[PDB]
Each structure stands twice: as C-alpha cells, then as structure tokens.
Amino acid sequence: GVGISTGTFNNQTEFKFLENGWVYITANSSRLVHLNMPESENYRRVVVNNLDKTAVNGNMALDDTHAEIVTPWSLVDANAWGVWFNPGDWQLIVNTMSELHLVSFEQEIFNVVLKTVSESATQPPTKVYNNDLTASLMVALDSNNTMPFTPAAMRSETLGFYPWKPTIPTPWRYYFQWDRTLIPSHTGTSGTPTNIYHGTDPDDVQFYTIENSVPVHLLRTGDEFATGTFFFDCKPCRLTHTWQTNRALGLPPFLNSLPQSEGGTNFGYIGVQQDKRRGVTQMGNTNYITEATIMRPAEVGYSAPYYSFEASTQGPFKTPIAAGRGGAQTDENQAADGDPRYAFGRQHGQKTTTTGETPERFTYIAHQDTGRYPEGDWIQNINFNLPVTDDNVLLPTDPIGGKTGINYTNIFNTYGPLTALNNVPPVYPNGQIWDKEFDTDLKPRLHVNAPFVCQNNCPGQLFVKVAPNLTNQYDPDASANMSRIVTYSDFWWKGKLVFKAKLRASHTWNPIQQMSINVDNQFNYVPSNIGGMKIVYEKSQLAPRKLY
Amino acid sequence: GVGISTGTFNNQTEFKFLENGWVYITANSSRLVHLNMPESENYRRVVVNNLDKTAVNGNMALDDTHAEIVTPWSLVDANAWGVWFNPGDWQLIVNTMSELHLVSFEQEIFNVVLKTVSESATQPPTKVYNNDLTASLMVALDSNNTMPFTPAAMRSETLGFYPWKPTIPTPWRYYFQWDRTLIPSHTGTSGTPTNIYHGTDPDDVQFYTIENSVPVHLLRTGDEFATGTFFFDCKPCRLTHTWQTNRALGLPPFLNSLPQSEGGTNFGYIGVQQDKRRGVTQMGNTNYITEATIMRPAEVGYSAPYYSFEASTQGPFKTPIAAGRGGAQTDENQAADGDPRYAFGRQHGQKTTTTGETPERFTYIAHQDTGRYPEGDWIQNINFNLPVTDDNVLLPTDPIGGKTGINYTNIFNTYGPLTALNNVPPVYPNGQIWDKEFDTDLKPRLHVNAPFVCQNNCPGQLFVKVAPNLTNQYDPDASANMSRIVTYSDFWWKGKLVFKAKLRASHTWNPIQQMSINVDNQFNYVPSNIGGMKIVYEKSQLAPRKLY
Amino acid sequence: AKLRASHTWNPIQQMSINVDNQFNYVPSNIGGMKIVYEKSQLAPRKLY
C-alpha cells in the first residue's frame, strides 16, 4: 500500500556480551539515499586521456589514462568504517577490544519514493514536484558476484557518515581493457618519449551488463527489498600493535655491571669485550658478537623499493608496500612511502560548512613499529674488516648509476622466507572494511586496503536505477536520446553489520595508550553553531602486544 | 494495489546440464514496451496502390499493390533470435551445441502504467504528464489461433534486441482479399500492359476482429497478465552444415599411382583408362566411367528457376528457393538468388547512433554447400558422343527464345524423387524462430523463413491496445471521430523461451570452425562513447557433418 | 572439467580453423603430419 511504511529507521549500535569474554557487536546503519535519473540510459565506453599532462617530460607519475564502461546504474556501497560506528563506539571498541571478527552483513531498502519535477513554462521560471505513484525503481543485487568488484572507499564515494544527512550513491563504472606504453623520462630528456594508447586487445574484452547477469526487482512506492543475511569467513583482525623489531627479540645480554645511582648518564655496562662474548651469530667469519650481529629467530619487516613504478599492459603503477615508515610518528608532515593518505569530502568527514572543493587530507601513521628506516641499514663487504672503508661499504649516501638523489635502498628488497609482517590496521572513518580475494591461482598474502579479505565471497553489490519514465513522443528509431520525464527517488537504506570481538585483559604493570577526549580535540566531536560536523581520523591499535 | 509491483525484470540466460549430454537452455527476455493510443478506434479497409511504379514498362517486379485491414490493436511479437540471446550466448550455442529443440514458451505483462498528456494552452506551449489511475489497457491473447498469423520478423518489427532500450509494438494489420492482373512487359513494350485491380471476390472475404474472436483482459496499473506455458512439438534444428555434394558421396576411385614428393604439382593418378574402368553408371550407352558419370545414391540439392515470377489471383510473387548459391561465399557482394537478405533498423542491430533512415542490410551466405552453380551444369544429347558439338549441347551461354541474357538454367527444375535438402539455417539476430504450418491438406516440406514449424499450433499472438479514454463531449451519433484524451502506456513484458540442445563431440583429427572475437570485429560487441550499440549477423552452422 | 558459461555481452576468443592454418591439421600427399602449438587460455576472467 502507498500509505503503509515498509520498514523502520534504525541506527543503534548494540553490544551483547557472550560467554568467555566475547562480545557480539551489532552496527545498524540507516540512511536516506537520493538518486537522480541517469544521464543516459545507454552503456558508454569512454577512453579517458590526459596525455597533455604526461606529454611534459618527467610527469610519468601523473598518468590517469584508462578506459571505462560508464553505466546508467548507481552503486550503494557501505564498505567504510564510518558508515557503521560513531566516534564513541569506535573509542569503546579500540580501548576495550583486542581482536575483531566480521560475522554477518544484511541490507534492505524501504520507503521508496519517486517524484517528478514539472518545470512550469511561466515567464518567471518555477517548478513543482509531484508524486508519480506508478514509477518503478530498479534494484539489482549481484548475489553471485558476477559483476567486477568496485569498492567505493578507494575513491571516497561510500554512503555518508552522518545518519541525519541524506546521502547519494555513486554512478557505477568499471574498467575496460586497454594497452599503453609510457617510457619514463626526466626534465631534460630530449624529444618526446614513446607515449601511445594502443587500444583494446580483443582477447581481453569483457562487457558486463546488469540487465543480463543480475535479476532486477522493480520497486514501487509500496515495495521493499532485503538482501538477506550474508555470513563472512574472514580471518580475525588484531586491534593491537607490535613494537618489537629484530633488535628486541629474545634474551637480552647479561649486564655484568649495573648502575648504582639514578641519573641520565648512569647506564648499564655489559662488561665483557665484544670479541670474547658468548652467543650465536649467522656471520661465520667474525668473532664480534653484538646486539646487531646476534642471530634473531626471523626478520620483522621487509625493505621494499620505495617510489618504484612498474609498467604492465595498462601502463605504470606504483609498487605497493605493506608497512609504515620508521620515525614518521614524530611528525605527520614527515611521512613517506607506505603511510596511507586519505582524501575525503564533506560527506566523509570534512567540515560540512567548509567552502571550496579542496578535499580534507590526512596521512595515517600506524602505531605498529614493524617498518623500516632506509637511512639506517647499509651494506658492507663480506670480509667484515672494521672500521669499514669506502671501498668496502655501500652507504645510503652513495649514488647508484650516478644519480645523486637515488641510493641503493631505492632498489633493495629484503623480502625472504624469514619475513614476518602484520595485517593492515583499520582506518577510521574513511577506511574500507572488507575486500574480495583475488581469482589468481596463487593469491596475495594480505591486502593493503582492507583488513578483512573474503576467502569465498563478499556480499553482492547493490545497484539502483530510476526506471525510464517515457514521454508520449518516444520513438526507438530516432538516433537522438530517449526523452524522459525528469524524475528522482528517495529511499531509506538500512543495513546491519555484525562483528564479534574479544575484550582485552591487562597483562602488565603499566597502563596502555587509550583514545580519550581532551582540550585539543574537544570540538571535533560536537556540532558547531551553524550545524557543522566533522569526523577526524582515529587510531585503531593503541594497545601493544608482544611478538616473541 | 497501485504501489505494489506485480513482477520482476529478468534477462538472464541459464544453462542447466542434464543427463546424457543434453542442455536445458532458458532464455529470459524482458523489455519495456511503450504504446501510444491508436490513430482511430475503427477498423479500416485500405487498398494500397502503386500503379505509378508499375505503370512504367518493365517494373513488374516492384508491385506493392494489396488490400489490408488496418486495426487499432498493436502486436507484441517476440519471434526473433535477437530478442532472447546476446552475442555471447549465441557464440556458446553455435560453438558447443550441435542440435536445438524448441521446448516451451511463456510470456507475461506487468507494471502496467497509463499516463495522459495535458497540453497547456499557455502562450509558450507546454505539456504535463499525469497518471490516470483508472485507465485500462486491453490485452488480448489469441490462444486458439483464430486470427491470421502475422509474424513480425518478416517485416523487422519485433521487439528490440537491447534490454536497456524501451521498445515499441507494431500496429496489427492483416491482408484482405483482392484480385489483380499484371501482364509482364519490358522496356520497349508498346502501349500499357493490362494492369488492373478487380477488387474483392465475395467468396473469399474474411473480416476478423479481436473483440469478437478473442477474450480481452482489462489491466489497470495494479494488474498483470500471464499467457501460461506453451509447449512446442517442432522438429529439431541442426547446428551443423553439410559439405558433401554428389561428387563427394561414396567410395572414391582407387588411385593406382600416388605422389612421391610433396608439392603443388604432384597429384595422384588413377592410372586406368576411362573406358576400361570398373563401376556402375546410370548411363546405359557409355563405357566411360568418370568421377562425374558415376552413380551416386541420390541428388544433394536441386536446381530451380531463379528470379522466376509466378502470377496468381493476387498478382506476381517471386518463386522461393530453399538453397544458397555456389561460390557466393567468396564475396557477399557476389550473392544471387536464394541467399536471404535482411534489412533492419536501429532497434534490430543497426548502429543506434546512425543518422538517416537507410536500413542496415546484409545477405546471409549460409555455410552449407548443398546449393547449385548455374554456370556449371549443362545438357547434352543422349548419344553422348564426345567431344560434344554445338548441335548436341545446350550450354548456359546459349539463349532461350532469342533472349541473350536468359539461358536454360533460368527455366530448369531438377527437383525429383531423389532430391535431398537441409532445413533453413538460423539467422542471428534478425531471423525468425518459429512459424505456423499451413492449413493445406498437403503441406510444404520446409519453410524458407523459420527453422521450426508448428505441427499443431504456435503460441497465441498477443495484442495490446490503450482503452478509449472518452471526454465529456462524446456523441455516438456524430459522424466525426471520437474525441479522446491523449494517453499512452508503458508496461514491462517478460518472456521465457526454453530450448533443449545437444553438446557436440569431436569426431575428427582436425579442429572445426568456431566463432571468435578478433581485431577486425572487436568493436562490434561493445558500446561506443556516445552509447552506440549494434548487433551484427552471426553464422549458425560452423561445424561440419558427414552426409553419407 | 567444468563447462564454461557466458557472463558478458560480447563473445570471447575461440580456437578455430581458418584459411591460414588450414593445412596444419591434415596430412600431405606424402603422408607428412604436423602438430602446431595451440593456446590454452583464450577465455578471459575477472580478477577483482
């Protein structure tokens, strides 16, 4: 019926404490989604080109050239932390939980409303909105994951984080195949390097369509759609950070002489000369046993080529790295490769009363200390004569290939059988929750964007489209675009995301770091006088844990 | 209810593999059909005349004169391959299937929406569309096949092939009886040949009306109509072509001398002189046994008078032929009588962004090699003296009746008790699927337009008509046309067509021809940047099979 | 093996006999045979 509501708005986070210290967390999110009709009812194949930018020698890092199928449909993506948890709930979770499991996910659409804009021809323009009770909203649910997976948080296009603000969906578009060549150059590179877009190789063409691969439900003003509960199987996400590096693994050396009076200069002394110490070292030609040369069980962290660009059929891409930098915690402005930087708009955290289109930005300096500090590690000759000379060492200050600004660490990879690393920490509120595992026979060990990875499947993507509202002059034989009555839709989206977490237990004398309100961040969690809201980034691994 | 949808859009093709290598194919097609009100509510009897064109001597092949009952109803015809299968599904079917059975067919209408255009009297013209919740759409289903069968694919008027494009139905009109005489003439024929339209002979008058012969359902915005499942009984359609002609039937001659070295000039030689060979020939007066005179089991193919025009009560018609031409596969522009040529519009394959009204055309050169090559076969005297002389042979270069451009093959028919031929191959996307068997006591062996022929009955035709929306000034005693409120309807049509196919099995060392994407046809299966789509013709019998 | 199912509008690449490779699958007049290399992953699939 038109006058009977088909659902209830619900945005309450529930905690239900189970046996053995586990907590059943239910995050109900509810939004009002506004949807305009598509620009055109037809699928487009658009080749986006920015050769003007890359035509300038040395700008190869600014390539946006690609090919995309632009579709008339719109994607309703809720794969972002902010959509589910308000700052207080996240504070509770990070301060008192230790591990997080993704349990279930369900979503539904109700109170579908379709309206048409009749723009009067009156000399002073005016427009009246009318309820078209017969219009239909097409809802498609890719339950079988037939369509390409296109997470929205990567582009900051998920639903809004404010329950009391209407949100808009994102027009769905998926990459089409293409070939590209961008020979790197630098300021001073003579001529124009080879920069060509070869087009689409026929063997790799895929042209998906929702109308052909997904059943489509037509919802009038009195209808509702529910996706049913989806159950995850993702690995647990740890809410604790590791501080121990190789230098802090195992039994420390025995201090034969200990300080006698408190002070900043009263250090402990091992006493025994370095060459006469007792231990085990992987270096078989030196008797010097040191805190640096001692044998650790394995390697915590791996050095990777940083700011290295790799070319493939589609052009250049930046090599990802799964660890943060060392010493970047001192200042966010001193961040470097590996620290994820998020840019977001007024829907996703930026002060809602800000003027201008400049996105709000922040670099997330993770609390885990498993990264690398390239200025430190060096290489020296096998003879290990000490002190080393210029001919027997390769310091980070040394050039490679004659380039004064590029040193050896830029092309150094220490990933090996002994490498150990942690999963990506959650980022609030702009961070993604789950991601799909790759279809490759051999699959990546971890993803750099989401902490939870679907082993089998992720929930089907939800697509919404205002059904065509034809005028009486329609003619399919006309090459011109279809004439449509201006129409839009407002519908309420309600989702339930269920987590399971473990409550932390104190295991040390000293307290641990905790998220708290303070005089500096006070006014970042309350509205301004003109209704301005914001959601600042919050750290998710404040509690430490021992690695070995 | 107004606000409750009565159906679901579904356009997914399903394959369900059964026992013993059979596949259950389900083609769900769904379209949005737009329907204007009829030009007039009354049945018209219109005599269409083009005597101006045929008044020119020698233009007898351009006769369109006829008589038709034009009805207010509109036909929703889905008898075309493109309506059901996208190019990928057809590729799968042709490459991996071998035979196809038509199993079942169902169709229904839902989400009926009726709107009225109120054209304002404002000095700058404007028009507002309103939902007339009480308007009714008349749907008639000729379940008993009372009405004349009027397939639409013959005129390229079936529903569209794009799920994401609204389609229009075709106004229904059926032939009325008439008599006509067109004495053939040629450029230079003195005077005006007898060209007269005698009118309708009373004994052969039939004036059908849907309101009198078919129950009519009135559907308001909250109603839906389903035709129920219809089950076919058509013969199977083979998805394999035959290459063997008479010259390649049976046991080849024994080659007494075989080539010794590979090369383009190292042929095998039979060795034995022609007159001394051993075999059987139907010619009882020649000892010459040859690869041409040897007795084959029967005749594959039949020569028929090509471009022969036969006159009947209604005038001249072109004699149909059920086989393609020989050697036309070299170039489509060299096609001739027997190759079906399809012309279609922007709904049925033509580039949807093309300007102009010129239809897109193609001639379907079937892969089966059972045709005839008229320039080849000849006739010679019974004596069979060799080499033949002019008086004892009738070559294709010889005139008949003194006409230098007409030879004997034009009036030659070799159809006989030994004739064998194949059924018409499917044509994608513009080809018809099924056709009705004739009511004649003796029925044709095959149809030249559809591969499947209804032995008992075909699904009832579906007719749609916007019910009259009378204004308050109506007066049945006025000779003028009824006044109606401008109205149109949009309703979703969903059909399910069920086939059963057999999967092919390899029976030779070499591979067979297959349909594949390639750099030439690449961009014929993906949209352009301005949304342009097209559906090119595809061949349906790429795999060969042995005849004998 | 598993039989493939169409999941796109456009067709996919397929191995087929053609006028260029015709005589690579039939014996010569002196009995000569050959078996040329053939590609085994002509159909595309989505990774993410």
Next chain:
Amino acid sequence: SLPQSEGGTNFGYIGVQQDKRRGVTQMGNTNYITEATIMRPAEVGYSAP
C-alpha cells in the same frame, strides 16, 4: 565530462584537477591522486632479475 560525439579524438575528461581529487594513496607526502598513484588492493605480477 563525457564525450558528446563519436570519434577517435572525443575522449572523456575527469574534470577535477589532480591535486584536488578524492581518494586514498599509499604515498603519504603527495596530494596528487592519479590513475597511477591510487592504492590498489595488491600487486598483480612481480618483476624479477
């Protein structure tokens, strides 16, 4: 901004300047979000000596 007429030179344009775009990148010291610098889930392929 999407193309209006079919042709080999009618490309689509993102419109927004590179430095003012919205997204996530693993490079924490550049505001330039590009089709090359954007963060992908993982690495398909590996360079080897």
Next chain:
Amino acid sequence: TGETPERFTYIAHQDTGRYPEGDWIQNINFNLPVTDDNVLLPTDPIGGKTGINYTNIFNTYGPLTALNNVPPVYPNGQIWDKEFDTDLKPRLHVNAP
C-alpha cells in the same frame, strides 16, 4: 629433411607480466617534474655497463604479490610434475600446471 628441431615460443595470453622499459624509480620527495638526480630511468647504467640497467637486478616480489599458474602448452607441454622434498616447497612450478 635435416636435424634442425622445430621451435616455437609460447606467448601466453595472460597479461600479468611486466614491461621493464616502463617502470622506473624516483626520489621520495616526489618533486615533479623529476630531474636527473632524482630519478633512475631504465636508460640509466648500473655499475657503468651501458647495456645493463636497474631492472636487471630488481625484484618486486613481496607479501602482496599475486600470480597465476603456468598455462598448459599443447602438444609438447608437460602434464604433471612431482612436488619437491624440501621442507618449504615452491608455490608453483614453471613446467607443469
């Protein structure tokens, strides 16, 4: 005639490879456009050898690496191979699927 073996290189249809002339390295500062001192292009020599560039000694295999199994080769390709006896075993074999 002759003992010369018939040869062919199998160019697999999978597009998960790398194009060494493309990918490059640049300084962390990421000042644009890059200068000579802040980039290491594939045209740059390593150790003074004009024909050997940095991609020759570059390994990007890491925890995020993903790759596909070797495609079958017909008719000369191997079908199956034995897994190694090592305690830690290779992820895939380059000769048999």
Next chain:
Amino acid sequence: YYSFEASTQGPFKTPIAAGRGGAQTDENQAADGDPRYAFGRQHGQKTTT
C-alpha cells in the same frame, strides 16, 4: 649478504636461511649464512681451559 637494516631500535643484520657454496672445503673460509656458535666451559669448552 652482510646487509644491515634499520628500524625503530637501530640496525640489525638481515638473516639468511641457507649456507654458502664451497665453504665445506675449509671452515675458515665460511661466510654469511653459516651459523657460528661461541660457548663456555659449561657448554662444551674444555672444562680445564
């Protein structure tokens, strides 16, 4: 081999899980990867040294 990597706690030697080739000829010719153990009179050293 003999590569030193720095982290929050300073430099550490990169471990390697394999021995050297040809080092079996002479123990004095060992190099990176061969574990070297130093022990006292409790753990093997001549107890009267």
Next chain:
Amino acid sequence: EFKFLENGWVYITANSSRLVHLNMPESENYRRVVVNNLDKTAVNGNMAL
C-alpha cells in the same frame, strides 16, 4: 570419451595407444659418465653455454 555428469561437470577419458620399439641396451652395465664441454666455456664470455 566425454561423459557429462551432474552440475555441469564433464568426465574426460583420454585413451592413448602406441606401438613401442625397443633395441637392446648398448651395454648391460651402469656407467658413470662425466660430460665436459670446457672447450665451449674456455672462450671468455660463453659462461651461458
């Protein structure tokens, strides 16, 4: 042979049959042979051979 099973799976059976010809061994004894091509690698720069 192809035998189509339930749920779209196919049971493929490849029967191969050959006639194998076998000469007697050159010698009944096991040999330990050191194959050397130092002539090729004696040329500087041919280490890849």
Next chain:
Amino acid sequence: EVQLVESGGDLVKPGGSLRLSCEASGFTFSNYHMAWVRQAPGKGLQWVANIDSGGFTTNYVDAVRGRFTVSRDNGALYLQMNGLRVEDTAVYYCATMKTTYCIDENCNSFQAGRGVFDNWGQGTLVTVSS
C-alpha cells in the same frame, strides 16, 4: 564551438610593460597546452612562448626569454610583457597545441606529440612607439 578571444593589444611606449589576455570558451581549456605566437608586420610567424596544462613548465624563445612571462587561471591565458622594445610591435595569437595525435582514421589508437596547433584565437595588435 571552440572560441578563443584575445585582448589587451594597444599602443605602448618602448621599455614599458603590458598584459595581454586570451579568454577561452566552448571547450575544456585546462586540458590543452597553450601557446603565444607573434607575427610582425608582413613577417612570418614567430613563437613567443608556450605553457603546459598545469603550469608545471613554460618555454620561451631567446628573444623574449627573461623578459616576458605566461600564466593561466583555468579560464584564460595571460602574457605579462616587460622591457618592451620597438621590434616587439606585432600581432599576437593564442593557440591550443595539439597534445594528442591519433594514428588511425577512426583514431582508436593515439600517441603523444608536439608541434601542431589545433585551434587559434582572433589575435590582437600591439604597437610600441611614441
């Protein structure tokens, strides 16, 4: 249709300064590299300067190097002229430098390039004298 309109041409004294403008409409001005090209009375075309699509780099000819400057604001182009001399009297035009060239008729594949100007403005006259 693409529209480029120049302005600012006027009589000026030698050794002074001036600002010429080139307004653009009907196309994505920010997606195209731009160029200033001058022609003296009855003389051939002479390249004055050029600027990229983001202002990262600008190039000049030796005659105006160190004297003039070019800038853009996503809506128009500006040429700042300093140290004007008598020979500078000429008519100046603003043209879009074709940064992409398709290599096939339907132009499915395209390549980067330089040295071809696609669209031109109207042009403005600058006279420097007493």
Next chain:
Amino acid sequence: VLTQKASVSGSLGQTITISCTGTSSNIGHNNVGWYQQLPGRGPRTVVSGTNSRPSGVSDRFSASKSGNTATLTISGLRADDEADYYCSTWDDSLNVVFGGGTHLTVL
C-alpha cells in the same frame, strides 16, 4: 627556422604541391602541421598530421612527411586558395619552429 618556398602559382583546378624542409633531427621525430593564412585572418589549421584534417576543412588538403621534408598537396586549386601557407613543428631543443611560409597564388 624551417625552409620554405616564398610563393607558388597555378591555374584553377590544378593539383599542386608545396614543401617545407628542416633538419631531420627536428622535423623528423616530431610532427608537422600546416596552416592557412588568408588576408585579415589568423592562421587556420589545415593539416594536423597523419593526413587528418580539422573539422570544417576542405578535404582537398593532404600532407605527408619523409625525413627532412614535409609535403602538402592541394587537390584542385580554387580562387580562395590564394593565401600564405605555414609549416610548424617541435624541435628537440625544446622549441616550436615555423617555416618562412609560402604565398600560394592563382593564375
């Protein structure tokens, strides 16, 4: 400066050719553009490489490039072709280099 011929002359309807020349190190690797210059007008791009013409340009124009030389061909002269023709390209010294022009004339 690229080399050009000062002027040419021909009768109406004649197919004619004009040439621009320069060092292959600059005119070779870089593209070449041809522009028309009528009295009282700014340069109009007539040929933009790859024998492709801008919209609204008569199809008579054609162009080709070979090493040091670039050739522009007109398929049938018309009275409106009396005008200056200008070649331009990029130069590996990071310059934009034009020719001296050629005043096409009609007898």
